[model samples]
Target: ALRKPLNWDLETFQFTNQDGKPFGTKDLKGKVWVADFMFTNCQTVCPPMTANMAKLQKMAKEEKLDVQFVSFSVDPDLDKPENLKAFIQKFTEDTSNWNLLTGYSLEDITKFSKDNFQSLVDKPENGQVIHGTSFYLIDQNGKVMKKYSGISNTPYEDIIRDMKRLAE
Candidate 1:
C-alpha cells in the first residue's frame, strides 16, 4: 500500500540528536518515520505528548514494525543533548529507534517546522514557547503523510495501524 504525497517534501535539514550526533533526512532515507515537536522544560502539553509518543514507540516495537521516531526540541538553546536524553528516558526505556533532537538555532527550527509540517513554533518572552502538539507521519520518501494529536485525544490505534500499513 502507498500513500499520496502531501503538500511538502520535508525539505532537507540536519540537527543533533540526543546522543549529540548529527541526524537529518539522510538518516531517514527510505524510512517511514513519525515525528513530534516538544521542549524539555514545558509544563503543559509536552509531558503528555511525550508520554504518548513513548507508548506509541512501545506499540510499534511490540508489533515488530521497523518504524523510526523523532522529536525536535522547540527550545533548542535551552535543551541540550543530555537534557533531551533525560526527558525521553523518563518516558520510555527503549530509545534505539528514536531520535530526540536539538542543536539548532530557534530561527532554523521555527522555519523548518513551519515549512515542513506547516506547524507554528514560537518562542516568546516567557520560558514557555508555543508549538504544535501533534505527531507527524512521514513517508519513506521524506514526505509528510498525516498528523495526529500527540496530546489530548490521540488516536493511538489509528497511528499504529497506519504505520503498519505503510510498513507493509
Candidate 2:
C-alpha cells in the first residue's frame, strides 16, 4: 500500500558485464532492475552484499518477477569481467539475470556511481575500494525508485514487492 520516493534516472551508456559483453541502461530500459556496488576482492561488506543480492535474485526468479540484477565493481581497474563472474559464482550458479558489471575505468565508475546513486566509490592504492552497500530498485522506465539495506537484514520481500508493483 506504499511506494518509496523515486530518485536518479541513470544516464545511458554501455558497459561490459561478467559475460564480457555489453550491458547497460539500454538493456535495462523498460525493465525492473536492482543495483549495488562492490569489488570482487573486498575484504569486508562485499561478500555479504553479494550473497544477499544472489538470494534476492533467486527469489525474484522463482516468483517470475522479470527482474534484473546489476552490481558495479568499484575497483574496476583490478576486476576483470571473468574475475567478477568467478566471485559471484562462489555464491550462486544461476547468473542468467545477475550481471556483475566492469570494463570501465576506475575514474569513470567513481563519477557514474556517485551521480546516479549518490554512492561513494573510494579506491586506495594500498587498500581496498570502498562503496555503498545498498540495493537499489529501478523501475521499468529506468529510474531508481528506492533502495534497501544490502548487508544483513535485507528487505527481500519489500524489494520483490516493489518489483512486482513496478513490473505491473
Q: Against the true structure, whose lDDT is highest?
A: 1
Query: Per-residue lDDT of 1-168 in model 1, one digit per residue for the tens?
Result: 435546367788788999999998999978989999999999888998988999888888888888899999999989999999989888988888899999989999999988888899998888898999989999887888888899888898888888888887
- After superposition, the stretches of candidate 2 with alpha carbons farther than 4 Å from their true spots are none
- Could you tell me every candidate's TM-score relative to the true structure? 0.95, 0.95
1-168 per-residue lDDT for model 2 (tens digits): 336467677898799999899999888898888899999888889998988988998898899888888999888878999899889889998888888899999999999988899988888776698788899888887888998999969998888877777766
CA lDDT of each candidate? Answer: 0.88, 0.87
